[PDB]
Amino acid sequence: GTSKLKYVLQDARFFLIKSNNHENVSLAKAKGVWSTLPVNEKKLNLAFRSARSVILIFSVRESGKFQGFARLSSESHHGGSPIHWVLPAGMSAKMLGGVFKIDWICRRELPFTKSAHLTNPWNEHKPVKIGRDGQEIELECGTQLCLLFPPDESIDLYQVIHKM
Numbered sequence: 001g002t003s004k005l006k007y008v009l010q011d012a013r014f015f016l017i018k019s020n021n022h023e024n025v026s027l028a029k030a031k032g033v034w035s036t037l038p039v040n041e042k043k044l045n046l047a048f049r050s051a052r053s054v055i056l057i058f059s060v061r062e063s064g065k066f067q068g069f070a071r072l073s074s075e076s077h078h079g080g081s082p083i084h085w086v087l088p089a090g091m092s093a094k095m096l097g098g099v100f101k102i103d104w105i106c107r108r109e110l111p112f113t114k115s116a117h118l119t120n121p122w123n124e125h126k127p128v129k130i131g132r133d134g135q136e137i138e139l140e141c142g143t144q145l146c147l148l149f150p151p152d153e154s155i156d157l158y159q160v161i162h163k164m
């Protein structure tokens with residue numbers, strides 16, 4: 001069902017994550033980690049303390065889709081085997097230092113064509129697919145967007161609710 005999902009999304013904050021390549025999103029799904037640029041890293045650390053759930057909604061650039069969504073389980077931390085991110089033109093690897101742990105809520109795709117009726121007040125009411133990496137999505141639009149994804153029956157939200 002969707003009752004536990006709605007509970008997790010209750011009073012959550014939502015952020016759009018734009019990745020330049022599929023390889024890093026695949027790595028994030030396999031390992032439960034994400035790294036972003038320092039400007040967005042600071043925003044996510046502040047949000048993590050402020051909200052019962054912080055949700056990252058992922059979209060690979062030029063894919064025309066979202067690839068899933070996940071909940072932050074930690075603030076960013078440095079120190080660990082450098083994740084073997086595929087670095088775009090000038091990512092320095094030092095800018096992708098700072099690793100957040102995430103718990104996937106949905107690893108299924110959603111095409112942008114399915115979200116065309118959702119606009120984001122925090123980005124001038126443009127369609128929610130439009131936005132830069134780290135753009136915050138207002139609560140009602142973010143909740144609706146997450147509910148549009150196909151159910152991911154491989155995920156049990158029971159352990160996620162306990163992190164809360």
Ligand SMILES: CNc1nc(Cl)nc2c1ncn2Cc1cccc(C(N)=O)c1
Nearest residue numbers: 018019020021024035036037085088133
């Ligand atoms: C593992 N984390 C990531 N992996 C990849 Cl492949 N792309 C990411 C990313 N995080 C943000 N992006 C998008 C991006 C790429 C280069 C420059 C900017 C800029 N704002 O100038 C933004």
